Amino acid sequence: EACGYSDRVLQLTLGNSTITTQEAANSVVAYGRWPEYLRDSEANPVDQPTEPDVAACRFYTLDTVSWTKESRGWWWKLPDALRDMGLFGQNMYYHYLGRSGYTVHVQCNASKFHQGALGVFAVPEMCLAGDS
Amino acid sequence: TNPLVPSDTVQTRHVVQHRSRSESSIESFFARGACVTIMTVDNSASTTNK
């Protein structure tokens, strides 16, 4: 853009929360499918759904972890990582069934004199191996 | 028997129903060969008592 706009600079707003970034590498939409509500043709439970909207569809920040020379990596599962997050977690535990999409924003700044590369992966059905 | 459906007693959403009763029709219920008997015969030499 001749009037200024760029790939690296984004603003995301959901509910009462806004994220800004001046050093992005674009955004990814998994399998090219944007989150959506359940369609009537695909519906299954017959009862009137609860849709929390802005109360639950907002940005929750989890605990900041720390990257070092010895870090081997970190993992999280959804919805589990959000189970205690405000009105989302509450709606989650009061109902037998639920579905959700997510905007995941991973934040890690450093300096022009640091180096390193983090691979951020969203895995469908991420079954992990046990210790036995 | 009271012909009620869920929208009669609870708030329902709209659902486009795909399920069918195809397999529980009377034909479909009985469309299986079933064992009704086992008959025993043999081929031995017929002798004065047996």
Swiss-Prot record, chain A:
It is found in: Virion; Host cytoplasm. This is Capsid protein VP2. Interacts with capsid protein VP1 and capsid protein VP3 in the mature capsid. Forms an icosahedral capsid of pseudo T=3 symmetry with capsid proteins VP1 and VP3. The capsid is 300 Angstroms in diameter, composed of 60 copies of each capsid protein and enclosing the viral positive strand RNA genome. Coiled coil: none annotated. The chain holds residues 74 to 205 of 2209 of the full protein. It comes from the Viruses.
